[PDB]
Amino acid sequence: SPIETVPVKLKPGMDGPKVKQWPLTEEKIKALVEICTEMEKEGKISKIGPENPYNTPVFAIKKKDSTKWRKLVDFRELNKRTQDFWEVQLGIPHPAGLKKKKSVTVLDVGDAYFSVPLDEDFRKYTAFTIPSINNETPGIRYQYNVLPQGWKGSPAIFQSSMTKILEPFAAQNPDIVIYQYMDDLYVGSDLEIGQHRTKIEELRQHLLRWGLTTPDKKHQKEPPFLWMGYELHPDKWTVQPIVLPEKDSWTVNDIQKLVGKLNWASQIYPGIKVRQLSKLLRGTKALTEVIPLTEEAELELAENREILKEPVHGVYYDPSKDLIAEIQKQGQGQWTYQIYQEPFKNLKTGKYARMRHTNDVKQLTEAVQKITTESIVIWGKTPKFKLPIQKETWETWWTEYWQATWIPEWEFVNTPPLVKLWYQLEKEPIVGAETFYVDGAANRETKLGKAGYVTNKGRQKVVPLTNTTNQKTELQAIYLALQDSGLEVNIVTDSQYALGIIQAQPDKSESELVNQIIEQLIKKEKVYLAWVPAHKGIGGNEQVDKLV
Amino acid sequence: IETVPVKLKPGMDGPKVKQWPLTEEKIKALVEICTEMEKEGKISKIGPENPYNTPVFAIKSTKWRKLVDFRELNKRTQDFWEVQLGIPHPAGLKKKKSVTVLDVGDAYFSVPLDEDFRKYTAFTIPSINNETPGIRYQYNVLPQGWKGSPAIFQSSMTKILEPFKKQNPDIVIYQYMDDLYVGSDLEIGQHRTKIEELRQHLLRWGLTTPDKYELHPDKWTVQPIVLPEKDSWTVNDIQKLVGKLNWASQIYPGIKVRQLSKLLRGTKALTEVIPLTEEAELELAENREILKEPVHGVYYDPSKDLIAEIQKQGQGQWTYQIYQEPFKNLKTGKYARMRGAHTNDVKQLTEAVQKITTESIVIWGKTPKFKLPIQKETWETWWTEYWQATWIPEWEFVNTPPLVKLWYQ
């Protein structure tokens, strides 16, 4: 095509490729020249002399066992050497962010990369050769004049070329939207279908004048569109159908493939869970090892199958309407969210889960950040939030938390499970409360240890412990003091570890000890924890470290 | 005139930083801005054979304003353009009684940029929902935000500024990126009228300044450590007080605590008061003073990086320390903002990050790397909503809190 070429350079301080054209079978050497000259005759290549010393391998195969063959070029050794290009779109557009249009047309251009010229000076570095059967004669020298199949530059040069070709037509048609993706165009408009079908044909002729072919209306896809694992319908979208295999044994590869399809489905199926199913691949290993199906992972797989039984869809985006996101807790540090404009019609859904032991509010805040980032990417704005948490509950937490946290527009929704703080240490030591001076220790080697206390009122305990850390006992020390004390109790510890974990106000944890410790803190009225430098003579701590 | 050639550090290739997603409001305000700029030669559209990239943002007044984050291109170049083309930093600017900051960034737009260099200035206006490829430009004039720009304009600035220098040999003028720091020992009201002179002087030589900010650095010290003061010391008070002073020992060695370690001999309850022994108040005064003085060994190292740590203190109050080795605090202070129905967490962290950077520029001619107490993704999201400055310091996010919260309040 008369498109103007993008100048390409070889990576600085490099030179073209030169490769051993390892001879190939003759029944192949046949179709290679048959297919080639049809390409030389369409101008997409040109036989060359010896002046150019670079070469590249060529191979031959069949269209999944079909009439015609196909030509192949391992450009790997050239790609190493060609400059970098601007990267092509990372992601793809999410159907939740498309606007309803009265028509949509899918034009896919055939022969994309070959329809587009290759920068002249850079053409030499594409040479190749067909094997003179047993060196009977010289080799058929060739070289490209279009964007070769699978080359570093091709996808980027094509996209900018196409983007430029569209600029004359988009200017004289400010009422019809075109999106690009690789080799396709997706044209939408709010033109009475009679007009729409006429513009598609103008666009087609336009594109054809620039040397880019495109499907007659007798060959144009129709709704629904099965696009990139999606179902784009005229007025709704959903994921293509999900299939979860029935097996009695699961390989760590088959567990990857399954938790895949489950994440995928979670963008619009509300309630999918993957906590237990991904707990398995925890112990990472080679994709082939057979992993036992746990009991909890099995109930999930059953609830997911339950959620997937019937279909559900999402609506499309309407900029005139507000954007709403709603969050619910699912327990295991698993959360679920819906984003909608209308209550019976979600734009989309999804799930957040913390991984390695925080608390309910901090987790909420993190989920609001997942959602906010996602919104911006998809709709370019941030939603309003309905959150299961009392304003008073939340003001209290950020007013005291050590990080800064942002609270965008939100309103409370009284839908259990509300999110609340389960206990708050006192700011100052309690009066009329016993005062425990816990401490603890273990043996790095034997893994034997003990935990105890000594209260002001002369009361003392010491327990023994096997299979514990210098830290698992320091938390056991505090659990002792809470078990053996009133509803108001002051505790004094020399372990910054323990003090930190508690001042963190967790409400659940992966350590089983910590859950019982949380239990006591709720069963208590006023608890003040306090820290003193470990074993430095203070008084109180000086005497309890001596027991343990 | 002709262009100053710019060579990257041999071996280092150009910036390739991904473009953050933006609100549509901001993408639009950028498209407007960038269409005016292209209309005036300041930038040009580019192809895919240019692979570099450098984020862009929109900040603010009622007028939007574009802000390119050239942090990566600075490291990859201006590091050899603080060497090859340094702007020297004057140690008298800090001592001046007042210091005003004038935005003089619009001057670079009258200077062409070396042809071979332009490719590394590329940036992208992003599309919403990956709907279209992205609008790609590259600078043809000296970009704001790049450190190599004021380096190149230096000679023109020294020239344009010399008539004002001679009529005012006592005023200090320092150029950092897009701003002029001009500080006088002058009375403030004089200072404020002397500033409109420099404004008029620059205005009648072609350099506009949109202004139509005032720091006082001669009070900026390393704030001292605050031992609590109490009539009666409960066992707890003595316990906190012992801990606060035990931490201080990492900074001021020479703190003595054995004497206040006896006043908690037997395991008394917490609410229990305890009078101060005399071997004790020996140390609530002996130690209460070896702490009001200076640390030792604490000098600025010009070959290292500065590091600012910030900690939220509660009720709109933040504390901060700037250092280069732990405990060797080169500078500490405290920021607070009156707002009411005005301020939240991230607006405050942001105001403080700028208040600390400005100071750090006045005092040293370079910005610190902040350890910020905030979720990484949260900061990446909202930090532009309150950014009023043209430079952008490096930063990194604090993972674990401090048990040492009160220890700087």
Short structural summary:
Chain A is α+β, with helices and mostly antiparallel strands. Chain A has helices at residues 26-40, 76-79, 154-171, 193-209, 252-266, 275-280, 296-308, 360-379, 391-400, 470-483, 496-503, 512-523, 541-544, and strands at 58-62, 69-73, 103-108, 128-130, 140-142, 176-181, 184-189, 225-227, 230-232, 237-239, 250-251, 290-291, 324-329, 334-342, 345-353, 384-387, 410-412, 434-436, 439-442, 448-454, 460-466, 488-493, 526-531.
- Which class of secondary structure composition applies to the elements of chain B? alpha+beta
Oligomer: heterodimer
Helix percentage of chain B: 25-40%
Q: What's the total count of β strands of chain B? A: 14
Span between termini of chain A: 85 Å
Give the helix tally of chain A: 13
Structure, described:
- The complex is a heterodimer of chains A (548) and B (409).
- In chain A, 33% of the residues are buried.
- Chain A folds into five domains: 1-88 and 114-154, no CATH class; 89-113 and 155-223, no CATH class; 224-317, no CATH class; 318-422, no CATH class; 423-548, no CATH class.
- Chain A has 548 residues and is an alpha+beta fold.
- Chain A contains 13 helices and 23 strands.
- Chain A is elongated, with a radius of gyration of 34 Å.
- Chain A has helices at 26-40, 76-79, 154-171, 193-209, 252-266, 275-280, 296-308, 360-379, 391-400, 470-483, 496-503, 512-523, 541-544; strands at 58-62, 69-73, 103-108, 128-130, 140-142, 176-181, 184-189, 225-227, 230-232, 237-239, 250-251, 290-291, 324-329, 334-342, 345-353, 384-387, 410-412, 434-436, 439-442, 448-454, 460-466, 488-493, 526-531.
- Chain B is an alpha+beta fold and 409 residues long.
- Chain B folds into four domains: 5-91 and 117-157, no CATH class; 92-116 and 158-214, no CATH class; 215-300, no CATH class; 301-409, no CATH class.
- In chain B, 28% of the residues lie in helices and 17% in strands.
- Chain B contains nine helices and 14 strands.
- Chain B has helices at residues 24-38, 71-75, 148-166, 188-203, 235-248, 258-262, 278-289, 345-364, 376-382, and strands at 43-45, 56-59, 65-68, 98-103, 123-125, 135-139, 172-176, 179-184, 214-215, 307-314, 317-323, 329-336, 369-372, 395-397.
- Chain B has a five-stranded mixed sheet with strand order 12-11-10-13-14, covered by helices on one side. In chain B, strands 7-8-4-9 form a four-stranded antiparallel sheet, sandwiched between helices. In chain B, strands 1-6-5 form a three-stranded antiparallel sheet, covered by helices on one side.
- Chain A: The record marks 436-437 as: Cleavage.
